[PDB]
């Protein structure tokens, strides 16, 4: 079905998901000079101290770490959000080289990878209903640049061997997502969509200004993953990112000046 190759890549997605050419598609390029500082925007409130990770899984497009979202144990609120959003999973998008990999870009600059922490608005009851609403999800986006190792990402890096191919999964408990956060929580925000099919326009994007750095050896491990299932020809999982989409009639607000 869909993927990131030339025959099923992002340029082909519109044929099965017409909304690919919609009005609030993601990702986008963040032009730092036309972004509007908005002093009425509140600080983000990330409460991940009760977070419960359960499993890590290679879904053939990326790898996801899933959390128990049966109760308000890891939530996001504040910022441009109203209500509570529960963390359901986080995943990454990365490139084949260090100069590409992120989905969002800042003044056209691409980062080595991009981490997405996905949350759904609890007023909707479950994830499936939330994706059907304009204010259903809140995704926290964090850029990764190659530099020094991120201690808090190593646990994730070491388990990849066990989920090398599509469909593989592994128990992944007691992982603390707080170890992936940059020091500052300043951000840009705009209304957008999921960056993979079905590309629903149900997301309030919150992109952090400050990147976290990971080491070259850490990102290398990501690139060893496979898109294919076991027993199939090896297709390295790299460049699983969608290019920037037209901003159209949207404004990017910044929480800092
Ligand atoms: C279960 C789930 O989170 N679905 C998603 N699909 N694309 C997403 S992204 N790239 O916009 O964060 S999240
Ligand atoms: Zn994503």
* Residue 173 marked in a binding site: no
For ligand 1, whether the C-beta of 119 sits within 6 Å is no
Question: Using CA positions, which residue lies closest to atom 13 of ligand 1?
Answer: 194
> What's the CA gap between 224 and 218, in Å, rounded?
11
C-alpha 118 to ligand 1 mean position (Å): 7
- State the distance between the two ends of the chain, measured CA to CA, in whole angstroms: 43
Given a contact cutoff of 8 angstroms between Cβ atoms, the answer to whether 103 and 85 are in contact is no
Sequence-distant (≥ 6) Cβ neighbours of residue 56 within 8 angstroms: 63, 64, 65, 66, 156, 159, 163, 169, 170, 172
| Six token digits for residue 1 | 């079905």
Sequence-distant (≥ 6) Cβ neighbours of residue 203 within 8 angstroms: 26, 136, 137, 138, 139, 191, 192, 193, 194
For ligand 1, whether the C-beta of 114 sits within 6 Å is no
Handedness of CA 129, 131, 136, 140 (dihedral sign): positive
Q: Which of 1, 12, 14, 61 is flagged as catalytic?
A: 61
| Six token digits for residue 103 | 């989905």
Could you confirm whether 7 is annotated as catalytic? no
Instruction: State which approach was used to obtain the coordinates.
Output: X-ray
For ligand 1, whether the C-beta of 214 sits within 6 Å is no
Superfamily of domain 1-257: Alpha carbonic anhydrase (3.10.200.10)
> What's the CA gap between 111 and 109, in Å, rounded?
7
Q: Which of 118, 126, 142 to mutate to test the pocket of ligand 1 (most atoms within 8 A of CB)?
A: 118
Sequence-distant (≥ 6) Cβ neighbours of residue 14 within 8 angstroms: 20, 21
For ligand 1, whether the C-beta of 118 sits within 6 Å is yes
C-alpha 2 to ligand 2 mean position (Å): 15
Neighbours of ion ligand 2 (CB under 5 A): 116
Closest to 67 in 3D by CA, of 43, 49, 80: 49
């Amino acid at each position: 079905h869909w993927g990131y190759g030339k025959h099923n890549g992002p340029e082909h997605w519109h044929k099965d998901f017409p909304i690919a050419k919609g009005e609030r598609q993601s990702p986008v390029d963040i032009d730092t000079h036309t972004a509007k500082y908005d002093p009425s925007l509140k600080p983000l409130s990330v409460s991940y101290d009760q977070a419960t990770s359960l499993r890590i899984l290679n879904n053939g497009h990326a790898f996801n770490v899933e959390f128990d979202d049966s109760q308000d144990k890891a939530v996001l609120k504040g910022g441009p959000l109203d209500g509570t959003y529960r963390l359901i999973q986080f995943h990454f998008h990365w490139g084949s080289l260090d100069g590409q990999g992120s989905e969002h870009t800042v003044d056209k600059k691409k980062y080595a990878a991009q981490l997405h922490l996905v949350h759904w608005n609890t007023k909707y009851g479950d994830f499936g209903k939330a994706v059907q609403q304009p204010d259903g999800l809140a995704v926290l986006g964090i850029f990764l640049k190659v530099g020094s190792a991120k201690p808090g990402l190593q646990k994730v890096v070491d388990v990849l061997d066990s989920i090398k191919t599509k469909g593989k999964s592994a128990d992944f408990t007691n992982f603390d997502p707080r170890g992936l956060l940059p020091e500052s929580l300043d951000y840009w925000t705009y209304p957008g969509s999921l960056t993979t099919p079905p590309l629903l326009e149900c997301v309030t994007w919150i992109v952090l200004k400050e990147p976290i750095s990971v080491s070259s050896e850490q990102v290398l491990k990501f690139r060893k993953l496979n898109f294919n299932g076991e027993g199939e020809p090896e297709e390295l999982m790299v460049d699983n990112w969608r290019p920037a989409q037209p901003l159209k009639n949207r404004q990017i607000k910044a929480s800092f000046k």
